[PDB]
Design a protein around this nucleic acid. Structure first.
Lengths: 40, 125, 135, 210, 52, 50, 124
RNA sequence: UUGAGAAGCUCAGACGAGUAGGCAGGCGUGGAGGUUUGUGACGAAGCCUUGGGCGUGAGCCUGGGUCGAACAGCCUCUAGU
RNA sequence: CUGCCGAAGUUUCCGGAUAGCAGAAACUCAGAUCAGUUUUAUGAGUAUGUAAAAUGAGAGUU
RNA sequence: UUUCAAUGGCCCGUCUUGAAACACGGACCAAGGAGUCUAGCAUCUAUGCGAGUGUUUGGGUGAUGAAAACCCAUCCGCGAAGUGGGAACGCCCUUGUGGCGUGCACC
């Protein structure tokens, strides 16, 4: 009755989740550096 | 498919044989199917047409017309039937030729030779 | 018969080029770029290498063969002159029937370039070799 | 079972052969390794021919649940021959068939953990884990063979901790649970495997010897 | 199996004939490209068709 | 695929495990006349498909 | 992306009007002394790649559709998913019986037919 | 976001004479193997036409007229092309 | 039919071997060189030449 | 499409020579009409096999078309008998260092 998600989907989701974390982490830093650069 | 190398499937040679046949070969070339009653009574599917044979036209414009075979025109592969004609300009009735395969024999002109031919092709008289 | 694409019409060479096009583009390995370049080359620019030369090159000077895979984009022929074949792991486009049997019967493994790409997708711990281009 | 019927072209015969396998695997006699390798060749194709996700995730449970039916003496051999037959056939599989063999390993990874727990009731846990760690290190996690695919081992690292927590929902005891991963990270000649296995593995040092 | 044989066993009805070997082992190249062995080392994929 | 049979629409599906059996290769389900429910049936029959 | 044609006149062969033996199908002049090859002033134009039309609007009829040649009802059903991109064009050798069947089928599919009135009459 | 004929899709910049000569990609013709469960007496092929359309072009599709028995698209082969 | 590349049209010996111009292949190579270019100053005789600066271009090849 | 108005606009092909010019060919239309086939040699590419390789002189065989396809006994032809450096490992924040170097060019 319950169809488990494919295991390749779980592996891709873990990889995509990690890549999104780096993008967001390097996006808040990008905003701060841009504000400091623009003042300079 | 044919497998004998004594028979040719060449269209050139088959057309030449048909259109250059002698009258003895042309006799068998113009054969007609027997009617159903004659087919089950003479145990023969088809026979060469002969004068005074009673036939019915099966195909063509003259379909359904009956009559005797007045003459077997072998030089043109045509049959001449009684009262199966066409009006001309001057009023004379020109006979119309019908191919032997387009007629069905309903009554045979039986003679001694035809009876021997019938029993020759596995036929009960 | 080089540069952009292989001139060969083999569909299975075209599939190998497909695999190493992705590897040469989505990794930072000069091995994958080198393999892709040699997949485009002609039969004249991919000379065969022998079982003897592979055995000689691996245990050369300092020897220390260890278990690095030998990769050649070409045919691995056989040297019937040599009597004993060491334990070698070779990945090649083609192996001859004599070369393949001698490697397997007394030695290790024979691989294709796609089996190698799964074992060493970055080409790490591989001995990439070439044949003598001078005929 | 006769192996040939296990890989038959209709699901009815494959199902019947599976049912008859329970009697075969329960006999109290020693089974050679080749006999289990031949059996797992048919059982691999029983799973390889499975059609729909509901069936092929219930069939995987049936195969995993078949481990405790096997006799205690030749139970390790049954699991060891599964990981050998999966290593040599893993690359021949295609994308539309890997997602169901991925679940087969996960069900068999949990089967080993459950069998360790079951044996731990009557024997010391360290001895049972040592027996399984020998099987893990002599088979998949062996560094002496370079032909074992990294896809199996990355999957094993991904599911090692979560399938262990399933068997012990309350808490797991201290044992060498992650010994095959430590042994193969330190000693393997596959640089890609040893560099990304620590990233994939979820080794929880809380319940391992420190 | 006697007409053709195998890659390792000679054909019985063809003297000294072995079935040809392939330069690729698993011809499903999408299985290799989208495998855990390869997808775990590639760098983060850039975008598809990029914005102007 | 979705195909029309004498006024009714069906969702035809095939899997790799029936590739060698042409008679049993394709399986179909009847799609409801309600368009909203027909979309739901496609979603639930094609679950975890690309 | 409305349809733009860089040129509507055809490229006629040089001296094709002077001589009836010379057809108007374009032939690249080869004479070195010929002023048409040298591209002097007042002479006729020559097919150049610059005259090529937009790739997006190439092969498109003035109504924005591309003509798709159709010979039976099987060909019309092919344009079920492309009725906004392609127009059906029945072949010239398709009989008036099949043309009728094609035209009714194309009408249900919402497919424009370029020559839907050929070889038929109407009777309301 | 579906935009994997990966031989596809997409982004960017620069450039554009041309004899001899060199190199690619295409158009068309006769015949052959395969294919379109292809077209055709409710009209094939050809021909005519200030009908319409497509391609930078070689060329191709089509309406009408004429006509009366065969003919074509695609993949490959071939040449008295 | 279209597209792309594209000369030489002459040194040297002497119908050619050439060279040179224009392409293909096999390379290596920016932590390096090349230039129908201008220089710095001194060498020789404003010109001329020099090794190492400016400017541009990744270049050398078989 | 026909025509008109404004602007422009030489007759092509060959040969010539610096391009020309000039001199040649061209009343018109249809059809026909010119780098082909084969035997060597060399190059490049593709394909099969690979210290080998090449069935078709011939034999076997081919029940349905049998000049095809399929199989190969013995011969024989040809062939054979110091540095730099691609790639990879381990360190170094990185450069860079260390061990290991195919092909080729130097010694």
């Amino acid at each position: 009755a319950s169809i488990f998600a494919p295991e390749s989907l779980l592996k891709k989701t873990k990889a995509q989740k990690q890549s999104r974390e780096q993008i967001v982490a390097a996006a808040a830093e990008k905003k701060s550096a841009r504000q400091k650069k623009r003042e300079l | 498919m044919k497998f004998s190398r004594d028979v040719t499937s060449s269209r050139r040679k088959q057309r030449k044989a048909h259109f250059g046949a002698p009258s003895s070969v042309r006799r068998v070339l113009m054969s007609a199917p027997l009617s159903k009653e004659l087919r089950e009574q003479y145990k023969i599917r088809s026979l060469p047409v002969r004068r005074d044979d009673q036939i019915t036209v099966i195909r063509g414009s003259n379909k359904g017309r009956e009559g005797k075979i007045t003459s077997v025109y072998r030089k043109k592969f045509l049959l001449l039937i009684e009262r199966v004609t066409r009006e001309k300009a001057n009023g004379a009735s020109a006979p119309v030729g019908i191919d032997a395969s387009k007629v069905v024999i309903t009554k045979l002109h039986l003679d001694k030779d035809r009876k021997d031919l019938i029993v020759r092709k596995g036929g009960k008289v | 018969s080089q540069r952009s694409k292989p001139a060969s019409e083999n569909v299975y060479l075209k599939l190998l080029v497909k695999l190493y096009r992705f590897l040469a583009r989505r990794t930072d390995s000069r091995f994958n770029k080198a393999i892709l370049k040699r997949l485009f080359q002609s039969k004249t620019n991919r000379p065969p290498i022998s079982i003897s030369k592979i055995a000689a090159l691996t245990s050369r000077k300092s020897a220390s063969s260890q278990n690095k895979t030998t990769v050649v984009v070409g045919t691995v022929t056989d040297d019937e002159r040599m009597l004993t074949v060491p334990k070698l792991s070779i990945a090649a486009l083609r192996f001859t029937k004599s070369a393949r049997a001698r490697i397997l019967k007394a030695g290790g493994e024979v691989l294709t370039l796609d089996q190698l790409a799964l074992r060493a997708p970055t080409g790490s711990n591989t001995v990439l070799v070439r044949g003598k281009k001078h005929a | 079972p006769f192996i040939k019927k296990l890989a038959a072209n209709d699901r009815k015969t494959r199902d019947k052969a599976l049912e008859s396998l329970q009697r075969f695997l329960s006999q109290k006699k020693k089974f050679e390794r080749l006999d289990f390798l031949k059996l797992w060749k048919g059982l691999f194709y029983c799973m390889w021919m499975a059609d729909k996700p509901l069936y092929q995730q219930k069939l995987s449970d049936n195969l995993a649940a078949l481990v405790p039916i096997v006799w205690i003496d030749n139970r390790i051999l049954f699991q060891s021959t599964f990981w050998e037959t999966m290593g040599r056939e893993w690359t021949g599989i295609d994308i539309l068939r890997t997602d169901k063999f991925y679940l087969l390993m996960r069900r068999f990874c949990a089967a080993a953990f459950r069998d360790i727990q079951t044996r731990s009731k009557t024997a010391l846990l360290d001895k049972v884990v040592a027996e399984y760690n020998q099987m893990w290190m002599d088979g998949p996690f062996n560094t002496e063979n370079l032909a074992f695919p990294n896809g199996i081992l990355f999957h094993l690292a991904d599911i090692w901790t979560e399938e262990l927590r399933k068997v012990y929902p309350e808490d797991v005891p201290k044992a060498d649970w992650y010994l095959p991963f430590d042994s193969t990270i330190k000693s393997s000649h596959n640089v890609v495997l040893r560099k990304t296995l620590p990233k994939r593995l979820d080794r929880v040092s809380e319940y391992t010897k420190d | 199996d006697s007409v053709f044989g195998s890659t390792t066993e000679v054909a019985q009805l063809k003297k000294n004939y072995f079935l040809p070997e392939n330069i690729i082992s698993n011809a499903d190249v999408t299985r290799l490209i989208n495998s855990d062995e390869i997808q775990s080392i590639v760098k983060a994929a850039g975008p598809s068709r990029v914005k102007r | 695929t979705v195909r029309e049979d004498n006024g009714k629409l069906y969702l035809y599906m095939k899997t790799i495990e029936r590739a060698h059996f042409p008679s049993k290769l394709w399986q179909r389900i009847k799609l409801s006349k309600n368009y909203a429910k027909a979309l739901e049936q496609i979603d639930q029959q094609l679950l975890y498909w690309p | 992306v409305n349809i733009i044609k860089k040129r509507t006149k055809p490229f006629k062969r040089h001296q094709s009007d002077r001589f009836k033996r010379v057809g108007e199908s374009w032939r690249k002049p080869r004479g070195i002394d010929s002023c048409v090859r040298r591209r002097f002033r007042g002479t006729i134009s020559m097919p150049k790649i610059g005259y090529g039309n937009n790739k997006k609007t190439r092969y498109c009829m003035p109504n924005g559709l591309k003509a798709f040649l159709v010979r039976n009802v099987s060909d019309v059903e092919l344009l079920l998913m492309h009725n906004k991109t392609y127009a059906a064009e029945i072949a010239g050798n398709v009989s008036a019986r099949k043309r009728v069947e094609i035209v009714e089928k194309a009408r249900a599919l919402g497919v424009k037919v370029t020559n839907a009135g050929a070889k038929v009459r109407s009777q309301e």
